[PDB]
Write a protein that binds this DNA or RNA. Structure first.
Ligand SMILES: *[C@@H]1O[C@H](CO)[C@@H](O)[C@H](O)[C@H]1O
Ligand SMILES: [K+]
Ligand SMILES: [K+]
Ligand SMILES: [K+]
Ligand SMILES: [K+]
Ligand SMILES: [K+]
Ligand SMILES: [K+]
Ligand SMILES: [K+]
Ligand SMILES: [K+]
Ligand SMILES: [K+]
Ligand SMILES: [Mg+2]
Ligand SMILES: [Mg+2]
Ligand SMILES: [Mg+2]
Ligand SMILES: [Mg+2]
Ligand SMILES: [Mg+2]
Ligand SMILES: [Mg+2]
Ligand SMILES: [Mg+2]
Ligand SMILES: [Mg+2]
Ligand SMILES: [Mg+2]
Ligand SMILES: [Mg+2]
Ligand SMILES: [Mg+2]
Ligand SMILES: [Mg+2]
Ligand SMILES: [Mg+2]
Ligand SMILES: [Mg+2]
Ligand SMILES: [Mg+2]
Ligand SMILES: [Mg+2]
Ligand SMILES: [Mg+2]
Ligand SMILES: [Mg+2]
Ligand SMILES: [Mg+2]
Ligand SMILES: [Mg+2]
Ligand SMILES: [Mg+2]
Ligand SMILES: [Mg+2]
Ligand SMILES: [Mg+2]
Ligand SMILES: [Mg+2]
Ligand SMILES: [Mg+2]
Ligand SMILES: [Mg+2]
Ligand SMILES: [Zn+2]
Lengths: 71, 104, 92, 50, 213
RNA sequence: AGGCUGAUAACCUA
RNA sequence: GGAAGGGCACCACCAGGAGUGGAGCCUGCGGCUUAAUUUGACCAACACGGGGAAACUUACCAGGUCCAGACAUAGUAGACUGAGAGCUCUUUCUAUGGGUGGUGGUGCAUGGCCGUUCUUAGUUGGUGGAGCGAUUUGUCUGGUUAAUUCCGUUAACGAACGAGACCUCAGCCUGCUAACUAGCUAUGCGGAGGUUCCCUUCGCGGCCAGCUUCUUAGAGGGACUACGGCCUUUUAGGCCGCGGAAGUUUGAGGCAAUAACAGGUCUGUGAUGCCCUUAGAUGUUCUGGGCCGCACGCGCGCUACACUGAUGUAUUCAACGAGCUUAUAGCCUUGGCCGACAGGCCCGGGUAAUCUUUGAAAUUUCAUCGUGAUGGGGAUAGAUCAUUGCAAUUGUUGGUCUUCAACGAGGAAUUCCUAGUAAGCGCGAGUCAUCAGCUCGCGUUGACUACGUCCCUGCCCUUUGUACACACCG
């Protein structure tokens, strides 16, 4: 399976909450943003967070989500 | 006047070994000396496999123990005195520096 | 343990000359690495010192480690009949 | 007394840590029994990776 | 001359044997470790002990004895090896020091329950992310049992254990048998690398706060 | 005698 | 639980492959025998104690020595023999207490370590709610995941472990760093072939040919299910597909919770309590024997029953790794010479990407054999040679000729395994003076079947019953 754990999901929501303007819909651009605005110990963890955050950005475009609060 | 001096570095820690290699190469570029290296020899992997149990009872489980040795070779074209000055700098713990005159 | 008097002096001389000594736990060894006396006689002779508290004994990895004490130095000086101003090399 | 030759065989070799003559690891000159080596493996510098 | 493989193994065996010799010679001096710094013309041995005043002895008498016996035992040239005593900066973050500290409390006669909590409380006060003390053996009854004293954070599995966990095991030779002391201390992330490992935990993710400029 | 069962009975094979 | 509902595992099955169980032999265990044939262990004992024991090991048996009994107190050349080992001759300690040693006993007194429950996903505080209370909720109706993985529900809210992350190895990089202990390309010279140029091939040289594709190893990049279609609740996520080195958490490992077992180890330990013994010793050493003893039963294996083969040629491609005190020389050994082989002698290299290493077998190829226990099989046995060692007999092993047993595919039963896997094939390492049918790794050749299920053997979770709690072996 490929279910994201709390570490990936929790981190992704926090990034989008306070960097929604910076985040984009491109995974390759997003993963470079995480390096700038976050300290992710491992590359593999960073890729998972970037991919899930990109998935959440697509969710926000169509409508609101549950765990993300955009002021 | 100018001789090819060989410097050999060995260590179990890669970062310490790489750090010393950079210092020597960078310390020689300041003097504008010709530098060949560092040359990284294949890593030597000492392996000891032993039974975990102090006795012979239970499932036969084994521990694979590895002690990796990393070796670097640097060649400096200069007189022994100049090489002695470069290598006189303090070396990181666990790094063995061996300076010999290459037989060519 | 009947240690020859000549060998006994060598152990005391070496022990008093240098406040420490060691010995491999190998009774079959012919000669002590630091003394011509047989290895066994070194181990047994300093066992007597350990019982009389003249030395302090430590054992690890099949090796003995003996350290002279204040009482041991006093005894050796009388036994060796040396001037009172001479002390083991560890005290200088 | 101790006249029998001890130039080779298990009797000649013993563990350098404990003195036991069984399961001696002679590779690389360790000269330690398998039980003692495992206890001191980390300190000697051996590590488990896989 | 010997090959590289044996030379490194020989160096490792020397460190292991040297530590054991000091572990027993300096058992009641707070011995916590040793560092072997081999350098050209001189090999330096640094002894770490909570109570350095006892390791050195009167006017450095004992330290000289250790240097002399070590030099002879390990075939070192005279006046080529030096022993230097050192004090542990944070005694409460060293499992070996705490394990030995608990060992002598039990030997003195202090109750296991009270002694273990004293070490457990002291370690946490020193700035440890967590601790765990285990005592096993014949406590009061004939049959043996284990008492576990745990507090704070702790990890068991994965690579971070090697960097974040400091563990020690010691034996207490009591009158009714042998007790087993196990002190397990989890360190805290120290960017300077002094109190604890500099590398963070793999699963710890930090988000920088946005700036308003 | 072997097999089956943790073991016995039962059962199976030679 | 021979109750119900859901999920899961090749130590379960299904579909299969190789088999094992039958034969010979190797090795371990029981039994028998023996002066002794030391002993632990009975899914989770039985090629296990790294336990491949000629001496040593060694704990067993038959004998001979030695004290290697600290410290403290009080007292006073012959005979024999396995061997002149010891005991005489000749020449120049004894009590008492207290110690020490012990592979002696107790793993049901213990420490530590390891195995197992248990490879599954499980485990636990605080505050709040419910109950007189044990206790419960949180930790869940449902969906989803390899996962107490997550989405959500919600008298719970917020956290701690395990899982995951992580670390090691492998798979991509014609991009970075740069190599006379790794190579390539070009060039020069030389050898051979073909037609002086030219072409093909090989050798050698160039720290000023150049370079890093191949080799090595540091730093980084790369995959996130990103993208498309469809299915799911706006979810979590799943299926298929393009591209891509890689789309099973990419593959394989390491690490690995709570609570437990009277699981193993006192024979790993100068880890250890108590007990036993301590000089007509259970200490230690020496000689010899035994641990291997053979009507029999069992377990892990090796070699086979052949033609998809054996034999004899020709031919040809790996990876992991290991290696010396230099004494004439103790390790790995090239080269030369002697020998049918085994092996020997001489000159050397290598403390090592430098030398061994110019480094395997199955296979490929041609010939012979021709369904006959046959040139299948190589057990058993005779003769003789050489090597290791102080010592080879109860064959240490390695050669030569001869001898040429069972076995023609294996009953009941039963093991392992889903891809570079199974199986076949050899190599290194550990043990090691000598000895591998074992173990731990390595590469080489390279499949069948499945992409499921809970029928069998088990495991996880809910409801339910209980007269069980030493818990249905009740
Ligand atoms: C005892 O303290 C030393 C201090 O340097 C530390 O290095 C050890 O890990 C700890 O046990
Ligand atoms: K069979
Ligand atoms: K076994
Ligand atoms: K135990
Ligand atoms: K509660
Ligand atoms: K040519
Ligand atoms: K033990
Ligand atoms: K005991
Ligand atoms: K052992
Ligand atoms: K034969
Ligand atoms: Mg964790
Ligand atoms: Mg994990
Ligand atoms: Mg399956
Ligand atoms: Mg089965
Ligand atoms: Mg089947
Ligand atoms: Mg077969
Ligand atoms: Mg049979
Ligand atoms: Mg059979
Ligand atoms: Mg099991
Ligand atoms: Mg043998
Ligand atoms: Mg024997
Ligand atoms: Mg004997
Ligand atoms: Mg004995
Ligand atoms: Mg013992
Ligand atoms: Mg037990
Ligand atoms: Mg409450
Ligand atoms: Mg390249
Ligand atoms: Mg990388
Ligand atoms: Mg567990
Ligand atoms: Mg038991
Ligand atoms: Mg046997
Ligand atoms: Mg087996
Ligand atoms: Mg044949
Ligand atoms: Mg080849
Ligand atoms: Mg025939
Ligand atoms: Mg074996
Ligand atoms: Zn040992």
């Amino acid at each position: 399976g490929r279910v994201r754990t709390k570490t990936v999901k929790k981190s992704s929501r926090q990034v989008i909450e306070r960097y929604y303007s910076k985040m984009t819909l491109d995974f390759h651009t997003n993963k470079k943003i995480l390096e700038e605005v976050a300290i992710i110990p491992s590359k593999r963890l960073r890729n998972k967070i970037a991919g899930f955050s990109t998935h959440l950005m697509k969710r926000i475009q169509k409508g609101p989500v549950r765990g993300i609060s955009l002021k | 006047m100018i001789h090819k001096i060989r410097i050999t570095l060995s260590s179990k820690n890669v970062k310490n070994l790489e750090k010393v290699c950079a210092d020597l190469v960078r310390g020689a570029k300041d003097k504008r000396l010709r530098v060949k290296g560092p040359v990284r020899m294949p890593t030597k992997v000492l392996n000891i496999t032993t039974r975990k149990s102090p006795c012979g009872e239970g499932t036969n489980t084994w521990d694979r123990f590895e002690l990796r040795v990393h070796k670097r070779v640097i060649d400096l074209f200069s007189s022994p005195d100049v090489v002695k000055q470069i290598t006189s700098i303090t070396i990181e713990p666990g790094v063995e520096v061996e300076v010999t005159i290459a037989e060519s | 343990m009947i240690i020859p008097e000549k060998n006994r002096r060598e152990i005391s001389k070496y022990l008093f000359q240098e406040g420490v000594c060691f010995a491999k736990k190998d009774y079959n060894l012919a000669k002590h690495p630091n003394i011509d006396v047989p290895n066994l006689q070194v181990i047994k002779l300093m066992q007597s010192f350990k019982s009389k508290e003249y030395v302090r004994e430590t054992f690890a990895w099949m090796h003995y480690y003996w350290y002279l004490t204040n009482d041991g130095i006093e005894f050796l000086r009388t036994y060796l009949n040396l001037p009172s101003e001479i002390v083991p090399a560890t005290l200088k | 007394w101790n006249a029998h030759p001890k130039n080779y065989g298990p009797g000649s070799r013993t563990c350098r840590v404990c003195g036991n003559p069984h399961a001696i690891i002679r590779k690389y000159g360790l000269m330690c029994c398998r039980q003692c080596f495992r206890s001191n493996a980390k300190e000697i510098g051996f590590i488990k990776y896989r | 001359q010997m090959s590289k493989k044996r030379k490194f193994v020989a160096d490792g065996v020397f460190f292991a044997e040297l530590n054991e010799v000091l572990t027993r010679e300096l058992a009641e001096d707070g011995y916590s470790g040793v560092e072997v710094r081999v350098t050209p013309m001189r090999t330096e041995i640094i002894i770490r002990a909570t109570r350095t005043q006892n390791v050195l002895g009167d006017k450095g008498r004992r330290i000289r004895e250790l240097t002399s016996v070590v030099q002879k035992r390990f075939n070192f040239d005279e006046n080529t090896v030096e022993l230097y005593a050192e004090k542990v900066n944070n005694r409460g973050l060293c499992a070996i020091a705490q394990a030995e500290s608990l060992r002598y409390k039990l030997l003195g006669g202090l109750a296991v329950r009270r002694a273990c909590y004293g070490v457990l409380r002291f370690i946490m006060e020193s700035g440890a992310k967590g601790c765990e003390v285990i005592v096993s053996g014949k406590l009061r009854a004939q049959r043996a049992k284990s008492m576990k004293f745990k507090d704070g954070y702790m990890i068991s599995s994965g690579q971070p254990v090697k960097e974040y966990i400091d563990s020690a095991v010691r034996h207490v030779l009591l009158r009714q048998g042998v007790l087993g002391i196990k002190v397990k201390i989890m360190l805290d992330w120290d960017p300077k690398g002094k109190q604890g490992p500099t590398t963070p935990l793999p699963d710890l993710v930090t988000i920088h706060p946005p700036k308003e400029e």
